[PDB]
């Protein structure tokens, strides 16, 4: 060994230039894609909002026009995924995890336009789903494309350019360049075997994709919540009790997304017409919920600050949470193209805010601001349920800039990923690839 | 291997409760260690100042005690390292890294004392060394010690408590939790084969250590630089330019320290008494420079807010950079106990600072603050000399809280690591472990 090691070192971090030059373009192409995906999504939500004004008098007529406008786009989505590309339903991150293991196919001629346009109908109709699964999938398929297009040879070239695509695709969905890289590193790489994924090339990928998002979005941020207060050391245990509550709830929610995954498949039995019709009813209900209960529908970025600043009552948080618990399953267990990453953040924020308001009334001697428990809890579902605490924290950190809370954040994050292991939970993104290799 | 995977996926992240409890006590010790080490280095450095005042009349007499007290503490720490633990010289990160390839032993009965006290000698005398090297190596061995004591078995617990040690070790050196966890992942782990390091454990390690640092060090931050300006998109191109500069200079630096080792070994040949004598020589010089040109000596963490704020001349920045490169080589190539990480920040800052100054006086259409070009190049020598940019980026992020510079910080880093790779450059820590294994 010792001989084998010495010349192995001498020759480390020498990623071949051709891989690098090819990693730039992947990021460039995913940014644009990701931006253009986001622009589309909004633009249709606007029409939904615009057609509400045109029928803004017959209150019964309004209920259905936002049903239909969204029922329609809901259906166009389930279809373009059933007819042309089955593996482009739901998140699609399981798929890319499988692809890295060499256990799933990368049909980019089929997925890129199915996801891109399938997503706009499920996103743009205002369904509880994030743009993350979509953009990470599109971004990897983009990365497979330039491997094909330029006929490069290797598993290094194949695994590297498939990953940077998926990393530059998560960055541009949150403006989270670090939490890009750290997702590759902590979650999606083959988790039981060594891999020739070049970190330095994943990097150049995330840089272009971010530079792309900033060209079409700058001077704006996705969540602004100010600088909240600091966390005394004699208060840090509250952030452990918070992770414990998240640690028990984490797997329960993992069960319910799997459990309900099957219970919607019973409905259509598999049949493309029983299915698309159910999804336009869900989608028609999401565009309809997003008109009476905007906080019970949609991705959920909206109510994250409106929750942090303690702008809700206790009841409204209990309500918004249980409602969203439900409308999240319906949209993702149905298998409509769209992640559960954003709609979990919203769940996490709503949860901690509730936890903070309770903490405030019990402990006036701590001079507490509930917004800190919201920021702590925001990436807490992502730690307890999909079990990527590191990526989850640096995600919330990159979107809220409350770095003084890095300790309470790190402690709650552990306190979930621990109490979730001590009660029988699973990486949901690997318990999918699990059940999707168990039928295959 | 399709069904091998399905079973591994279902069994992912279930670290043994005892290993979680054990990383908890390692962190707690590694912390208390680095806290004491830091309080220590401080007291010594302070008693050195208290002597100059008992003697401020006779200015030559002043320059004598400035020399000798460093010389005495220099020798003492050289001696302590040769007479009782020779792998505790220089930095100690290569050794802990070899300890994970199982090519180098963790002689914790010997290094814990030899590093800590030899460290307190070299650092405490005002030598150009970072308390990070020590606290990492020390932290690892503290992990090994709790292994060799509780007689826990398995490559998992050995590689893990070895890791969380070093990670909590680096955390407490810079109050940088994420930077230590990421240090293990990007750099510390064995980079040519898979491994069993429980990252969740490394967290419990680092958390406890970070807490212990906060218990003795709150309400004062290692660096407070305030909230500098943003960077508009049409200035990014200048940060990538700063990366390119470090890329060609990183490797020119690695070479010197290597050669400068040889050149310094030719001085003593191996003989303990020439070496120790050469130590107090170097040592005393730093103690002297510390009194007469203090920017050229010390750990470097001191003049890092001074250089950002635009309080140095441009001549000064050139001077400091040359002079500090000169002393940084003497102090670290000599093998004196102590790291290079903290002095490498300084050299990086002092350079990026002088870049911003020129960068301002050429492009006032851009409205530049030279402080941004320092913050970029703080984690820059950490990218082209040790090619672990994802850690320097996050490390700098932890110390300066200026997230708005994420893009140019990232960008400047990739600039240095790409050009270091391309002008024929070897990572610094690895390229040390090699010349060792070849001599073994």
């Amino acid at each position, epitope marked *: 060994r010792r001989r084998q090691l010495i010349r192995q070192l001498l020759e480390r971090d020498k990623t071949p230039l051709a891989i690098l030059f090819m990693a730039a373009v992947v990021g460039t192409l995913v940014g644009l894609a990701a931006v253009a995906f986001d622009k589309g999504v909004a633009w249709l939500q606007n029409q939904r909002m615009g057609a509400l004004v045109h029928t803004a008098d017959n209150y019964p007529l309004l209920l259905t026009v936002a049903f239909l406008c969204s029922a329609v786009l809901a259906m166009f989505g389930y279809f373009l995924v059933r007819k042309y590309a089955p593996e482009a339903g739901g998140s699609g991150i399981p798929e890319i995890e499988g692809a890295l293991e060499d256990q799933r196919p990368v049909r980019w001629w089929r997925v890129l336009p199915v996801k891109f346009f399938g997503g706009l109908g499920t996103l743009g109709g205002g369904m509880v789903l994030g743009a993350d699964g979509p953009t990470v999938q599109i971004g990897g398929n983009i990365g497979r494309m330039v491997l094909d297009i330029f006929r490069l040879k290797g598993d290094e070239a194949r695994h590297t350019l498939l990953a940077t695509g998926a990393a530059a695709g998560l960055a541009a969905a949150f403006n989270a360049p670090l939490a890009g890289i750290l997702f590759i590193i902590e979650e999606m790489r083959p988790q039981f075997r060594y891999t020739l994924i070049s970190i330095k090339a994943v990097f150049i990928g995330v840089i272009m994709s971010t530079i792309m998002y900033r060209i079409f979005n700058h001077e704006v941020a996705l969540i602004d919540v100010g*600088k909240l207060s600091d966390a005394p*050391l*004699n208060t840090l245990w509250l952030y452990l009790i918070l992770g414990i509550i998240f640690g028990i709830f984490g797997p329960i929610f993992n069960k319910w997304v799997l459990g309900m995954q099957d219970l919607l498949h019973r409905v259509h039995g598999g049949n493309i017409t029983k299915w698309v019709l159910m999804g336009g009813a869900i989608g028609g209900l999401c565009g309809l919920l997003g008109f009476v209960a905007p906080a019970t529908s949609g991705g959920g970025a909206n109510l994250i600050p409106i929750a942090t600043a303690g702008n809700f009552s206790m009841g409204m948080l209990v309500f918004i949470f249980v409602a969203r618990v439900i409308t999240t399953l319906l949209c993702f267990s149905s298998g409509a193209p769209g992640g559960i990453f954003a709609p979990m953040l919203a769940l996490g924020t709503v949860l901690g805010t509730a936890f903070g308001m309770v903490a*405030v009334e019990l402990f006036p*001697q701590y*001079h507490l*601001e509930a917004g800190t428990f919201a920021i702590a809890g925001m990436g807490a579902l992502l730690a307890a349920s999909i079990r990527a605490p590191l990526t989850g924290i640096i995600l919330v950190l990159e979107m809220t800039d409350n770095y003084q809370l890095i300790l309470p954040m790190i402690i709650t994050g552990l306190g979930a990923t621990l109490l979730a292991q001590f009660t029988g939970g699973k990486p949901l993104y690997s318990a999918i690839l699990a059940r999707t290799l168990a039928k295959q | 291997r399709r069904r091998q995977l399905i079973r591994q996926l279902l069994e992912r992240d279930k670290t043994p409760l005892a290993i979680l409890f054990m990383a908890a006590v390692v962190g707690t010790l590694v912390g208390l260690a680095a806290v004491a080490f830091d309080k220590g280095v401080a007291w010594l450095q302070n008693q050195r100042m208290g002597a100059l005042v008992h003697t401020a009349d006779n200015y030559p007499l002043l320059l004598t005690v400035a020399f000798l007290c460093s010389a005495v503490l220099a020798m003492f720490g050289y001696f302590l390292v040769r007479k009782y633990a020779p792998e505790a010289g220089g930095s100690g990160i290569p050794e802990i890294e070899g300890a994970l390839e199982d090519q180098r032993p963790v002689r914790w009965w010997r290094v814990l004392p030899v590093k800590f006290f030899g460290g307190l000698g070299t650092l405490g005398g005002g030598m150009v060394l970072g308390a990070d090297g020590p606290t990492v190596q020390i932290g690892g061995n503290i992990g090994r010690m709790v292994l060799d004591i509780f007689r826990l078995k398995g490559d998992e617990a050995r590689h893990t408590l070895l890791a969380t040690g070093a990670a909590a070790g680096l955390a407490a050196a810079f109050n940088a939790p994420l930077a230590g966890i990421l240090f293990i992942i990007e750099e510390m782990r064995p980079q040519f084969r898979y491994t069993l390091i429980s990252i969740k454990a490394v967290f419990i390690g680092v958390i406890m250590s970070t807490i212990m640092y906060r218990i003795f060090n709150h309400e004062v931050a290692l660096i407070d630089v305030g909230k500098l300006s943003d960077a508009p998109l049409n200035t990014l191109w200048l940060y990538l330019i700063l990366g390119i500069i470090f890329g060609i200079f990183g490797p020119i630096f690695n070479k010197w320290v290597l050669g400068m080792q040889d050149l310094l070994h030719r001085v003593h040949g191996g003989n303990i008494t020439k070496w120790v004598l050469m130590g107090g020589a170097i040592g005393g010089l730093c103690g002297l420079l510390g009194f007469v040109a203090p920017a050229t000596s010390g750990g470097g963490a001191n003049l890092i807010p001074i250089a950002t704020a635009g309080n140095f001349s441009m001549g000064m920045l050139v001077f400091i950079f040359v002079a500090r490169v000169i002393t940084t080589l003497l102090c670290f190539s000599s093998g004196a106990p102590g790291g290079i990480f903290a002095p490498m920040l300084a050299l990086g800052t002092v350079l990026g600072t002088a870049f911003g100054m020129v960068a301002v006086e050429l492009f006032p259409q851009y409205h530049l603050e030279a402080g941004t070009f320092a913050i970029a190049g703080m984690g820059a020598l950490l990218a082209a000399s040790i090619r672990a940019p994802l850690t320097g980026i996050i490390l700098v992020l932890e110390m300066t809280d200026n997230y708005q510079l994420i893009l140019p910080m990232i960008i400047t880093g990739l600039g240095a690591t790409l050009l270091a790779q391309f002008t024929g450059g070897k990572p610094l820590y690895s390229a040390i472990l090699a010349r060792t294994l070849a001599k073994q």
Partner: antibody
Amino acid sequence: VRLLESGGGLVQPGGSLKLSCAASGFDYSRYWMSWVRQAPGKGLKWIGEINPVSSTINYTPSLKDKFIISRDNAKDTLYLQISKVRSEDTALYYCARLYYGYGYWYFDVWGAGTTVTVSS
Amino acid sequence: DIVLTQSPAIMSAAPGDKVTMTCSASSSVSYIHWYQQKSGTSPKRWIYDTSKLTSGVPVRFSGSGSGTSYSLTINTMEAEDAATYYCQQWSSHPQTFGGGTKLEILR
């Protein structure tokens, strides 16, 4: 870094008056301010506190609106206004900036004090 | 409300002595604070978190205690130390002050 209070003097019994504290030398927001009083020759006695965004406010066991504490971070000023005054609010009124060590909160920096006399 | 009660209302002492005053509480407090108030002056945060010294407090001062006994100690009191000292707890809202130990000087 200073605290300068004012507005004190003479009140008729049962009346009311509004004290003021002018902060300088620091971000007056991101800081809980507080009021403590001292009857002539007696000891300190907490009155009330107020978090930065005027979101949270606490008082000692007082009555309905005996005390009301305001802050207009725009002018870096704390306010206190006592009503239905009586001879035991004759006291010296201190304005303190709160803060914490481990997290058990203390009165970091106190002002000079404005003096209130309740007499006919 | 917690009632803090400080042990000698008035003590005289002569420079060079060791002087100790004591803060005792109705129930349990922890990490209490001490303020020094020299005549005609706003109180000064003097010792906090039971035993930590506000920057600028000379090392002749020290704090200690737990549970319901807390003390402040001047070790070789010097004469500029004459004041009424006040303790304060905030481990129970509403936080509450002691009632003063006025240090007089013998000369």
